[PDB]
Design a protein around this ligand. Sequence first.
Ligand SMILES: CCCCCCCC
Lengths: 79, 88
Amino acid sequence: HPALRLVDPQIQLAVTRMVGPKVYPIILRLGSPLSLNMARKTLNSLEDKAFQLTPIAVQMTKLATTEELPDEFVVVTVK
Amino acid sequence: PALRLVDPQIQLAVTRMENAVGRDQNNVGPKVYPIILRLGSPLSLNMARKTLNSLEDKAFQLTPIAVQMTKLATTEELPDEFVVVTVK
Ligand SMILES: CCCCCCCC
């Protein structure tokens, strides 16, 4: 019943292990939902530094027709 | 759940198409960030290329990809710029 969902092309997957860094579109077969946080060590004190997590809102159109699928991509599956 | 550290073979690519003001920020390239999983429900990853190009229905060649992820225990193991993927 989970229909394939296409992640918009500002979020892609770089796979160096198969042939150099290659960006690949992302398909999601969501079983459980999924969030996406950007982490940087920019909460600088006088001595330490902390991590701030700014969530990234990823737009996910669900796939209408399988003809829309690209020639090549990666399928991330969440159970 | 526990924090796994995906090895540099697999990283997230994020492109800033514009700026905050909408300034056309093209020809600057993507930005690759190491991935870390707040992994609850387990996760899979398959490369896919189209095959069976006899027009009938388009088919895809799903070759699984080995996700080498290492459990992290210290903060200096954590880079100063990364991405956290959270699954329930
Ligand atoms: C919304 C992007 C999901 C990327 C998951 C990558 C896990 C190796």
